[PDB]
Design a protein around this ligand. Structure first.
Ligand code: 1YN
Ligand code: HEM
Length: 527
């Protein structure tokens, strides 16, 4: 022990007498070996889920997870069961697959897990400060409450003809259609659907002013900001590059535009019940008296529009793509449209949308096969014991839940990779609380979150956009169906998802060929 500790000090010193060709090369090799040693040691633990073995420190299973998460989850499930962890770019993600995982994560106590600590870097740089994940959970709960106030049956009743008008205007004016001058055409659905989504959501949620603005070069800011909404933000939220400056600039310029409208309306007391802007002007005071600022209101609007943008656009693209090889479904949907709208002699209303179950089943089935968000996260805040196991998930870990994975299991949905809207006969609702309920601040929602079908999650972070989504997707598809037939270019089929984008959007270029059902029909109005 005497000469031992001396040779420790000697050894520390001889280390520095190494050529750096050796010293840098061991600066790499040492973490690599400890990593493997720590993993081998880790596997001993009884109070830890199996950890997926990986070679590269820090990076972890990022590549295979990133490129094909559901295949990754399937392989891990086979070897280890439903609970397992894996390292991902410096973090430890504990996956819990299936309905019990949904319960473990979505109904976890506010104290145990944090969504804002998982998500804030993704969103705060894009939306702005003070809202959504840049604030405490109870602020979020009430912001969801505020937004829900513009998402009522009466609002949907007034949105439908606005959304309809936008779809027709797009058919009339967009270079991708121009139905008054073309009877057939080819389109990339990842060009047309993001455009139709932003036009329809602008007009209805933001109002005529902000929609009007999309016909100016102001539209280039949306693109700039949109490009800033990327999973890279999870790792690099701010880097001194043109991309990040374009984004930052856009967030300032767009929120400034919203603030201009807001202050303009208040100045004239032109505060009605037209749109989400009016709504948040009348109704954005928290339960402790603090009022949202005009800046926070605008940042909230950006997030809502942005979130709704990507989930919905990706979804209507997938609907288009699945219907492109299924002329039978198109036909079936067309007949439902003729019946409900009396051969087209009835105008589409919100109430009539509700009497189109096949259409709604089509949305529902698309969301089963193409959950836009394949992985939902929470950062673990307090150590968590996994019920009926010896597993304890320690603070500093992340829990990862994936209803999108369960959506694609045959055990829960027979023939899960087949598109079949009739699996939802007797069950065309977007979702519905199968039993008892609970209120976190934005309204009574289902207490249990064990449904195998769960595109809108559940618990305190449950989506509040599902009825707006169905309204938007519904009006849009109703008009697509009554106006066009479409199919694939010869030899093409449904693309595989891109699991590396923000949403599980189709892999490009995803093209379909459209043709007018009534070549002679004209869309009125000015252009
Ligand atoms: C680097 C190597 C490469 C191979 N690699 N290695 C890993 N990956 C990778 C891993 C994971 C992912 N992602 C995909 C995106 N994903 C994700 C995206 C958004 C998201 O949103 C959850 C919250 C926050 O945003 C919204 C989204 N939303 C919900 N409804 C509508 N939008 C949200 C909620 C509320 C509001 Cl107001 C706005 C928004 Cl945006 O909900 C959650 C997860 C995480 C995993 C991507 C790439 C790679 O690409
Ligand atoms: C196809 C359409 C959509 C799907 C599948 C979807 C899905 C989801 C999911 C899964 C979550 C929870 C994520 C988690 O648990 O971590 C969520 C949250 C949320 N979504 Fe959506 N969404 C959709 C459309 C919309 C729309 C149109 C809006 C706004 C109009 C919207 C606004 C929100 C909001 C405000 C939250 C709450 C965030 C939180 O509480 O943390 N979503 N959505």
């Amino acid at each position: 022990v005497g000469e031992a500790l001396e040779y420790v000090n000697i050894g520390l010193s001889h280390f520095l007498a190494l050529p750096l060709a050796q010293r840098i090369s061991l600066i790499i090799i040492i973490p690599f070996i400890y990593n493997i040693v720590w993993q081998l040691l880790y596997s001993l633990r009884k109070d830890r889920p199996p950890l997926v073995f990986y070679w590269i420190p820090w990076v972890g299973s990022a590549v295979v997870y990133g490129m094909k998460p559901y295949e990754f989850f399937e392989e891990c499930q086979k070897k280890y069961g439903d609970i397992f962890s894996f390292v991902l770019l410096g973090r430890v993600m504990t996956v819990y697959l299936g309905p019990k995982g949904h319960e473990f994560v979505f109904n976890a106590k506010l104290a145990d897990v944090s969504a804002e600590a998982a998500y804030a870097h993704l969103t705060t740089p894009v939306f702005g400060k003070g809202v959504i994940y840049d604030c405490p959970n109870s602020r979020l709960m009430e912001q969801k409450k505020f937004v829900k106030g513009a998402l009522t049956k009466e609002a949907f009743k007034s949105y439908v003809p606005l959304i309809a008008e936008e779809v027709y205007k797009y058919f009339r004016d967009s270079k991708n259609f121009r139905l008054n001058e073309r009877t057939t055409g080819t389109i990339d659905v990842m060009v047309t659907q993001p455009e139709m989504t932003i036009f329809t959501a602008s007009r209805s949620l933001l109002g005529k002013e902000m929609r009007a603005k999309l016909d100016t070069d102001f539209a280039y800011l949306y693109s700039d900001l949109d490009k800033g909404f990327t999973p890279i933000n999870f790792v690099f939220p701010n880097l001194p590059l043109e991309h990040y400056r374009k984004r930052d600039h856009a967030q300032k310029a767009i929120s400034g535009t919203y603030m201009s409208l807001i202050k303009e309306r208040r100045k004239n007391n032109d505060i009605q019940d037209r749109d989400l802007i009016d709504s948040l002007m009348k109704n954005s005071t928290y339960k402790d008296g603090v009022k949202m600022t005009d800046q926070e209101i605008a940042n909230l609007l950006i997030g809502v529009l942005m979130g709704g943008q990507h989930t919905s656009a990706a979804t209507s693209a997938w609907i288009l793509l699945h219907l492109a090889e299924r002329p039978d479904v198109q036909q079936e949907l067309y007949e439902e449209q003729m019946r409900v709208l009396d051969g087209g002699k009835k105008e589409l209303t919100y109430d009539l949308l509700q009497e189109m179950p096949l259409l709604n089943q089509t949305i529902k089935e698309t969301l089963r096969m193409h959950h836009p968000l394949h992985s939902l996260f929470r950062k673990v805040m307090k150590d968590m014991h996994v019920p009926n196991t010896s597993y304890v998930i320690p603070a500093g870990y992340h829990v990862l839940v994936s209803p999108g994975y369960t959506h694609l299991r045959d055990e829960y949905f027979p023939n899960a990779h087949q598109f079949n809207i009739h699996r939802w006969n007797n069950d065309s609702a977007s979702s519905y609380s199968v039993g008892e309920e609970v209120d976190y601040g934005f309204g009574a929602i289902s207490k249990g979150v064990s449904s195998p079908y769960l595109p809108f999650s559940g618990g305190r972070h449950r989506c509040i956009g599902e009825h707006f989504a169905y309204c938007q997707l519904g009006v849009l598809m109703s008009i697509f169906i009554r106006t066009l037939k479409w199919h694939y270019p010869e030899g093409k089929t449904v693309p595989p998802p891109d699991f590396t984008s923000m949403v599980t959007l189709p892999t490009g270029p995803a093209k379909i060929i459209w043709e007018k059902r009534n070549p002679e029909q004209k869309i009125g109005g000015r252009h």
